[PDB]
Amino acid sequence: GRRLVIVESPTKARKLASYLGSGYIVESSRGHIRDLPRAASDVPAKYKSQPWARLGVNVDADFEPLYIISPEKRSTVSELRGLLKDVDELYLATDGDREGEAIAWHLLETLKPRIPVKRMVFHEITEPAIRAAAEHPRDLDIDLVDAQETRRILDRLYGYEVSPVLWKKVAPKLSAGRVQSVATRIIVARERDRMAFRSAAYWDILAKLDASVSDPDAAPPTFSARLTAVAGRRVATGRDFDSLGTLRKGDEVIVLDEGSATALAAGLDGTQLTVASAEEKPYARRPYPPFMTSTLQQEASRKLRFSAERTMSIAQRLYENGYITYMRTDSTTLSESAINAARTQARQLYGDEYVAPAPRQYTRKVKNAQEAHEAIRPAGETFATPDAVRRELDGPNIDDFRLYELIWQRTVASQMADARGMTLSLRITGMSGHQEVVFSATGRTLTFPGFLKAYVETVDELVGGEADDAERRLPHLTPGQRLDIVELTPDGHATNPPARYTEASLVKALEELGIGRPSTYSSIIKTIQDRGYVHKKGSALVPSWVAFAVTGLLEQHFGRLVDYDFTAAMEDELDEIAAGNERRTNWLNNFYFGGDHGVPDSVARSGGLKKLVGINLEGIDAREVNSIKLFDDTHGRPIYVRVGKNGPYLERLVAGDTGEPTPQRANLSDSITPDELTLQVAEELFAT
Phi, psi angle pair for 366, to nearest 5°: -90, 145
Q: Minimal CA–CA distance to 430: which of 592, 276, 639? A: 276
Phi, psi angle pair for 39, to nearest 5°: -160, 170
Decide if 194 contacts 497 (C-beta within 8 A).
Answer: yes
Q: Count the alpha carbons within 13 Å of 181 in the hemisphere toward its beta carbon.
A: 25
Could you give the angle at which helices 127-135 and 10-20 cross, rounded to 10 degrees?
A: 80
Q: Minimal CA–CA distance to 222: which of 489, 426, 476, 474? A: 474
Burial of 612 (0-12, 13-18, 19+ CB in 10 A): buried
Contacts of 116 (CB under 8 A, 6+ apart): 88, 89, 90
**Secondary structure letter of residue 667 according to DSSP:** E
Partners of 3 in the beta sheet? 24, 89
Partners of 280 in the beta sheet? 424
Phi, psi angle pair for 203, to nearest 5°: -125, 150
Could you give the angle at which helices 503-512 and 521-530 cross, rounded to 10 degrees?
A: 130
**Secondary structure letter of residue 38 according to DSSP:** S
The one-letter code for the residue type at 37 is P
Q: Minimal CA–CA distance to 279: which of 427, 473, 421? A: 427
Q: Minimal CA–CA distance to 176: which of 612, 518, 544, 553? A: 553
From CA 71, how far away is CA 126, in angstroms rounded?
35
Say if strands 253-254 and 233-235 run parallel, antiparallel, or are unpaired.
Answer: parallel
Contacts of 428 (CB under 8 A, 6+ apart): 209, 225, 273, 274, 275, 276, 438, 439, 440, 441, 483
Grouping H, G, I as helix, E, B as strand and the rest as coil, residue 367 is coil
From CA 323, how far away is CA 386, in angstroms rounded?
11
Question: For the chain, what percentages of helix, strand and coil (3-state, to nearest 5) are there?
Answer: 40, 20, 40
The one-letter code for the residue type at 309 is E
From CA 323, how far away is CA 343, in angstroms rounded?
19
Element (DSSP H or E) covering residue 521: helix 521-530
Give the method used.
X-ray
Partners of 643 in the beta sheet? 648
- From residue 209, give the alpha-carbon distance in Å to each of 121, 214, 218, 472, 676: 65, 12, 12, 15, 40
Q: Minimal CA–CA distance to 123: which of 319, 283, 349, 275? A: 319
Q: Minimal CA–CA distance to 105: which of 79, 140, 64? A: 140
Decide if 145 contacts 98 (C-beta within 8 A).
Answer: yes
CB atoms within 10 A of CB 310: 19
**Secondary structure letter of residue 383 according to DSSP:** P
From CA 140, how far away is CA 121, in angstroms rounded?
10
> Residue 76 CA to chain centroid, in angstroms?
35
**Residue 326 falls in the annotated catalytic set:** yes
**Phi-psi bin for 30: left (phi > 0), alpha (psi -120 to 50), beta?**
left
Q: Minimal CA–CA distance to 421: which of 443, 447, 393, 399? A: 447
- From residue 38, give the alpha-carbon distance in Å to each of 42, 156, 206, 280: 6, 10, 66, 67
Contacts of 324 (CB under 8 A, 6+ apart): 124, 315, 318, 376, 377, 378, 379, 404, 407
Grouping H, G, I as helix, E, B as strand and the rest as coil, residue 458 is coil
The DSSP line for 242-276 is -TTSPBPSSS-EE-B-HHHHHHHHHHHTT--EEEE
Phi, psi angle pair for 177, to nearest 5°: -160, 110
Say if strands 534-537 and 540-543 run parallel, antiparallel, or are unpaired.
Answer: antiparallel
From CA 558, how far away is CA 620, in angstroms rounded?
11
Q: Count the alpha carbons within 13 Å of 343 in the hemisphere toward its beta carbon.
A: 16
CB atoms within 10 A of CB 596: 7
Contacts of 76 (CB under 8 A, 6+ apart): 29, 30, 33
From CA 336, how far away is CA 328, in angstroms rounded?
20
Contacts of 167 (CB under 8 A, 6+ apart): 174
Question: What does the radius of gyration of the chain's CA atoms come to, in whole angstroms?
Answer: 31
From CA 467, how far away is CA 643, in angstroms rounded?
42
Decide if 29 contacts 80 (C-beta within 8 A).
Answer: yes
The one-letter code for the residue type at 671 is S
Asked if the peptide bond before residue 220 counts as cis, ω within 30 degrees of 0, the response is: yes
CB atoms within 10 A of CB 21: 9
Burial of 178 (0-12, 13-18, 19+ CB in 10 A): middle
Decide if 495 contacts 238 (C-beta within 8 A).
Answer: yes
- From residue 674, give the alpha-carbon distance in Å to each of 196, 329, 473, 538, 610: 11, 36, 41, 15, 35
Exposure class string for 501-524: b at 16+ Cβ within 10 A, else e: bbbbbbbbbbbebebbbbbbbbbb
Grouping H, G, I as helix, E, B as strand and the rest as coil, residue 225 is strand
Q: Count the alpha carbons within 13 Å of 195 in the hemisphere toward its beta carbon.
A: 21
Long-range contacts of the stretch 381-387 (C-beta < 8 A, 24+)? 381/126, 381/128, 381/337, 381/341, 382/341, 383/338, 383/341, 383/342, 383/345, 383/408, 383/411, 383/412, 384/323, 385/345
Decide if 549 contacts 555 (C-beta within 8 A).
Answer: no
> Residue 322 CA to chain centroid, in angstroms?
26
End-to-end CA distance of the chain: 79
The one-letter code for the residue type at 507 is V
The DSSP line for 621-636 is -HHHHTEEEEEE-TTS
Which H, E and C letters describe 592-617, residue by residue?
HHCCCCCCCCCHHHHCCHHHHHCCCH
CB atoms within 10 A of CB 324: 30
Query: Among 158, 160, 202, 326, which one carries the catalytic annotation?
Result: 326
Decide if 455 contacts 410 (C-beta within 8 A).
Answer: yes
Contacts of 675 (CB under 8 A, 6+ apart): 191, 194, 195, 197, 497
Give the angle subtended at the CA of 476 by the CAs of 473 and 479, to the nearest 5°: 130
Element (DSSP H or E) covering residue 77: helix 74-84
Give the angle subtended at the CA of 438 by the CAs of 434 and 443, to the nearest 5°: 160
From CA 118, how far away is CA 108, in angstroms rounded?
11
Burial of 94 (0-12, 13-18, 19+ CB in 10 A): buried
Grouping H, G, I as helix, E, B as strand and the rest as coil, residue 175 is coil
**Secondary structure letter of residue 364 according to DSSP:** P
Phi, psi angle pair for 589, to nearest 5°: -60, -50
Element (DSSP H or E) covering residue 158: helix 142-169
The DSSP line for 530-547 is HTTSEEEETTEEEE-HHH
Q: Minimal CA–CA distance to 273: which of 481, 487, 478, 477? A: 481
CB atoms within 10 A of CB 625: 20
The DSSP line for 635-652 is TS-EEEEEEETTEEEEEE
From CA 361, how far away is CA 186, in angstroms rounded?
34
From CA 54, how far away is CA 511, in angstroms rounded?
35
Partners of 234 in the beta sheet? 229, 253
Say if strands 482-494 and 273-285 run parallel, antiparallel, or are unpaired.
Answer: antiparallel
Q: Minimal CA–CA distance to 320: which of 100, 26, 99, 14? A: 14
Q: Minimal CA–CA distance to 157: which of 588, 561, 650? A: 588
* CA dihedral (657, 659, 661, 664) positive or negative: positive
The one-letter code for the residue type at 511 is E
- Using CA atoms in the order 54, 57, 58, 63, what is the torsion angle rounded to 10 degrees? 180
From CA 169, how far away is CA 553, in angstroms rounded?
8
From CA 567, how far away is CA 184, in angstroms rounded?
13
Grouping H, G, I as helix, E, B as strand and the rest as coil, residue 291 is strand
Q: Minimal CA–CA distance to 3: which of 116, 87, 117, 115? A: 87
- From residue 45, give the alpha-carbon distance in Å to each of 40, 48, 50, 70, 73: 11, 5, 10, 15, 19
From CA 288, how far away is CA 334, in angstroms rounded?
13
Longest dimension (CA), the chain: 99
Exposure class string for 384-402: b at 16+ Cβ within 10 A, else e: eebeebeeebeeebebbbb
Decide if 281 contacts 474 (C-beta within 8 A).
Answer: no
- From residue 194, give the alpha-carbon distance in Å to each of 244, 247, 677: 11, 18, 11
Say if strands 482-494 and 435-444 run parallel, antiparallel, or are unpaired.
Answer: unpaired
